[PDB]
Design a binder for this molecule. Sequence first.
Ligand SMILES: *[C@@H]1O[C@H](CO)[C@@H](O[C@@H]2O[C@H](CO)[C@@H](O)[C@H](O)[C@H]2NC(C)=O)[C@H](O)[C@H]1NC(C)=O
Ligand SMILES: *[C@@H]1O[C@H](CO)[C@@H](O[C@@H]2O[C@H](CO)[C@@H](O)[C@H](O)[C@H]2NC(C)=O)[C@H](O)[C@H]1NC(C)=O
Ligand SMILES: *[C@@H]1O[C@H](CO)[C@@H](O)[C@H](O)[C@H]1NC(C)=O
Ligand SMILES: *[C@@H]1O[C@H](CO)[C@@H](O)[C@H](O)[C@H]1NC(C)=O
Ligand SMILES: *[C@@H]1O[C@H](CO)[C@@H](O)[C@H](O)[C@H]1NC(C)=O
Ligand SMILES: *[C@@H]1O[C@H](CO)[C@@H](O)[C@H](O)[C@H]1NC(C)=O
Ligand SMILES: *[C@@H]1O[C@H](CO)[C@@H](O)[C@H](O)[C@H]1NC(C)=O
Ligand SMILES: *[C@@H]1O[C@H](CO)[C@@H](O)[C@H](O)[C@H]1NC(C)=O
Ligand SMILES: *[C@@H]1O[C@H](CO)[C@@H](O)[C@H](O)[C@H]1NC(C)=O
Ligand SMILES: *[C@@H]1O[C@H](CO)[C@@H](O)[C@H](O)[C@H]1NC(C)=O
Ligand SMILES: *[C@@H]1O[C@H](CO)[C@@H](O)[C@H](O)[C@H]1NC(C)=O
Lengths: 237, 199, 288, 50, 88
Amino acid sequence: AYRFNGIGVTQNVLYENQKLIANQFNSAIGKIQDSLSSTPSALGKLQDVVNHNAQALNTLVKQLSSKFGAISSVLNDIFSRLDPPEAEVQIDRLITGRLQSLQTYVTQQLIRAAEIRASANLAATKMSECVLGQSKRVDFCGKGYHLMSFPQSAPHGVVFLHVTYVPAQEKNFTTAPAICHDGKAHFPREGVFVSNGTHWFVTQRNFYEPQIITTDNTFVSGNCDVVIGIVNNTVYD
Amino acid sequence: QKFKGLTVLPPLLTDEMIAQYTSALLAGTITSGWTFGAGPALQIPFPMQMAYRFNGIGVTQNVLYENQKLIANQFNSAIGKIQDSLSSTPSALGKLQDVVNHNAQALNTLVKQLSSKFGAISSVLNDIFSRLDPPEAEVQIDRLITGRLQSLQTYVTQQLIRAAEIRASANLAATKMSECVLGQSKRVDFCGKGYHLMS
Amino acid sequence: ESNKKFLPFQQFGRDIADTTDAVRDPQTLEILDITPCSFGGVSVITPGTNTSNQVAVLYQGVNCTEVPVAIHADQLTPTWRVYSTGSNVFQTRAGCLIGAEYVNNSYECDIPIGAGICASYQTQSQSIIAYTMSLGAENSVAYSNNSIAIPTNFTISVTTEILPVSMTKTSVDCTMYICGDSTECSNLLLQYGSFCTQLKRALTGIAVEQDKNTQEVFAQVKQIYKTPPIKYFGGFNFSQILSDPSKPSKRSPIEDLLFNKVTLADAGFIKQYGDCLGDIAARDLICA
Amino acid sequence: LLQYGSFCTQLKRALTGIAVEQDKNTQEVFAQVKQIYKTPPIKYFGGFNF
Amino acid sequence: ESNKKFLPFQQFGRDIADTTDAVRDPQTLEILDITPCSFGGVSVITPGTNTSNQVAVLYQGVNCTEVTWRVYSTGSNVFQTRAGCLIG
Ligand SMILES: *[C@@H]1O[C@H](CO)[C@@H](O[C@@H]2O[C@H](CO)[C@@H](O)[C@H](O)[C@H]2NC(C)=O)[C@H](O)[C@H]1NC(C)=O
Ligand SMILES: *[C@@H]1O[C@H](CO)[C@@H](O[C@@H]2O[C@H](CO)[C@@H](O)[C@H](O)[C@H]2NC(C)=O)[C@H](O)[C@H]1NC(C)=O
Ligand SMILES: *[C@@H]1O[C@H](CO)[C@@H](O)[C@H](O)[C@H]1NC(C)=O
Ligand SMILES: *[C@@H]1O[C@H](CO)[C@@H](O)[C@H](O)[C@H]1NC(C)=O
Ligand SMILES: *[C@@H]1O[C@H](CO)[C@@H](O)[C@H](O)[C@H]1NC(C)=O
Ligand SMILES: *[C@@H]1O[C@H](CO)[C@@H](O)[C@H](O)[C@H]1NC(C)=O
Ligand SMILES: *[C@@H]1O[C@H](CO)[C@@H](O)[C@H](O)[C@H]1NC(C)=O
Ligand SMILES: *[C@@H]1O[C@H](CO)[C@@H](O)[C@H](O)[C@H]1NC(C)=O
Ligand SMILES: *[C@@H]1O[C@H](CO)[C@@H](O)[C@H](O)[C@H]1NC(C)=O
Ligand SMILES: *[C@@H]1O[C@H](CO)[C@@H](O)[C@H](O)[C@H]1NC(C)=O
Ligand SMILES: *[C@@H]1O[C@H](CO)[C@@H](O)[C@H](O)[C@H]1NC(C)=O
């Protein structure tokens, strides 16, 4: 009820649709659990994280078979078949090539580590705001009006289960920005003036709930001759 | 450049497609407020949406409902003056100009590096092979090959670093698109200098 | 033939890269050009070999009527000459595409090709089709200055987000990697400075940073709260996310599903050397 | 040059990665919504001038 | 001892890194394997020298049932970890 009050929905909505909301949440949880198994390529991010390290180590191992311009890739053969004056000339090439390979590996690892650190900082921020509270940022903590989130552990990462609120089943109405009564304008405190074609009602924003117009939910603030589109009707006491 | 093995590939999304995306975003904003970013788009008149946004920043609806004409004129004047300012000041698009210039100069340096000697006797492989025999021709060939490989490695490393920076900027731009355009932000100095209304 | 006018008795001509571009014939005083023979990139568009063995070829930066003289045709194998002019040729800004049939429809993009052009494997007789990618379904909401829309029903939805946190911590040994069993190589390598110290410092920094990342993500709270013995939360149950004692490591069913889905190819951490030497026939990558 | 191994292929792999990343950046920035709305034929919005 | 099936015309084996793995004895034509003898890293665990001079040694990735200074012997202070074997 607090979390619906957060996004602009009164408590009575949940207090009257508790069972429906619970059933919907249960069905969604079951559906996502089945969908994770059904979809083969879901965890591509983590799979790529593993594959990058595997491929880099394999390339580093494979690089040992190069000659880099010398006569052989085995140091013992050079030592056995050449005198030191030429052995040094042949060996420095191999040493330099292997040093270059190691340097390239280290630089690539540094760049990838920076990227992973950025991702980890984003994950920590999402854990702080999505899970330990209710977020107001748009498209942060899921698509829609945020309700809550849950963390789950994964190899080399984390998975978030965002729970959001989505409207549905819209309907057209006729609206007016103010209401004239006894020569006084009337604006709604919280709501929008809507008409069903005969009678005018004040309803909340994101859930159709018509209410009678009364002094309690309106304030006067001026005169009817300034506003554009104002409509005159009677307000009860 | 293409005669030396360096090519430029075209982007997947064309300018027409990007313009269509931008026009769709603008139309959705104008005709529905922020509802199209949270669910199905719901119609609402523009003065009422602006009243919603004054209510958001902390000003009652009557202020706009009584100063509608003045606010509209002020908005029109500002949006008109933006074009004049952009046309006048010839230093506004500095970031994008630098983005173009960096790539241009990097490619130019990579191309021009092909004329270096790297301690060899010449920068022409054909001349080296024509004037020397293998036992010491291979030394010069190795020198040239190592130098050119070093040049390629330097180019690739700089490109990787610049790509990381551009990715950070693009992530920030995506966040601004999500929060400043599809809603109204409460962060200070994130959208604009003052109480944010639109984008 | 060259139309560049030349100051007389001037022979050579260079380009931006300072290479020979125009030459003067010694016998007849005529100026020629040394533009390289035609060339360009070749890209192969294929679905998985698990499905079919049909491919399409893209020629970057080449107009479709110049391909046979650009790829040096009429000498390659007849299999390669099929992917020459032949039939079903389309022209894009990226270059000439041969082997795919253009289609007037528009779907989502499957295999990116060039500027707004994609490709896919369609049933139409399976074939390869190239089209223009679709931006999405057309829509138009009706704007009015006295009309509003208000929802009358809601929906609870649950999505999924995946983020990497840490990578694998490794370590390298210069002497073992470069010299191996030799000792004279080590004696020679002792004269190359502190490259090994630098690499060790970098790898150690990365290794510590990974653990720091994990701690920052997960060690938010410091009190280990316990789940109440009974599970009733007004009709919601959370059995799919709470711990299951029977399952290994007291993990949730969803966590077990994730751990089974991700194929961690590095078992490791089993201090394996005796079994590493024992089973040579395995050719284990970790042992290698 | 054939005697240098994958040191001539690592650069190609990295460049391809960057090239794919650029398109990913553009897609994430601009493809926020997948419904192509159309602007009303009449362009009167309370006195605002678009 | 080896069980590789060398063909009669083959006399050497190679790994991914093109290093000799198997060999055939010239006098007695049998097949043998070559593996380097064990090695591994060493780490020292100490408080600050301002506090004490006692240290501990960790042998990374080594099962210490088969474990230039040999002063740090067992001493009934041998413990087994996943990252190695702690001594001291
Ligand atoms: C709001 O949506 C829910 C979800 O569809 C509706 O509940 C369903 O109503 C139908 C019709 O009575 C039943 O057959 C279903 O069993 C209900 N549950 C589900 C999960 O579908 C609810 O009726 C809607 N509210 C209104 C006012 O239309
Ligand atoms: C929690 O909700 C789920 C949703 O179905 C239930 O999980 C299964 O429910 C079926 C229905 O009878 C049982 O047959 C299964 O044994 C349940 N578990 C599994 C793994 O399928 C679960 O029963 C619900 N919890 C409670 C206390 O009712
Ligand atoms: C509102 O009116 C328009 C008129 O064109 C209609 O297209 C739209 O669907 C209506 N909304 C409904 C019926 O929910
Ligand atoms: C509109 O609401 C009024 C309530 O005063 C009711 O009398 C009338 O029947 C309603 N009309 C429609 C079309 O719902
Ligand atoms: C509102 O009242 C005025 C006079 O009090 C009258 O002229 C006007 O017609 C009324 N509004 C409507 C919509 O009839
Ligand atoms: C080159 O010499 C030949 C004689 O072999 C002669 O026929 C030809 O005309 C000469 N060309 C000149 C002088 O340009
Ligand atoms: C056809 O090829 C020629 C060869 O250079 C090129 O100049 C021309 O622009 C090409 N035509 C089209 C329409 O691209
Ligand atoms: C409202 O919309 C209609 C139709 O687009 C237009 O004719 C009219 O001028 C607008 N304004 C008012 C106050 O009716
Ligand atoms: C504002 O809209 C009017 C249409 O009434 C148009 O004539 C005018 O050019 C627009 N403003 C600007 C600055 O173009
Ligand atoms: C090789 O010579 C030794 C003695 O020198 C002998 O014992 C052995 O049988 C010989 N092996 C072969 C294969 O001839
Ligand atoms: C260490 O070696 C002993 C004896 O070979 C063995 O019983 C024990 O399981 C080993 N520890 C491991 C493999 O962790």
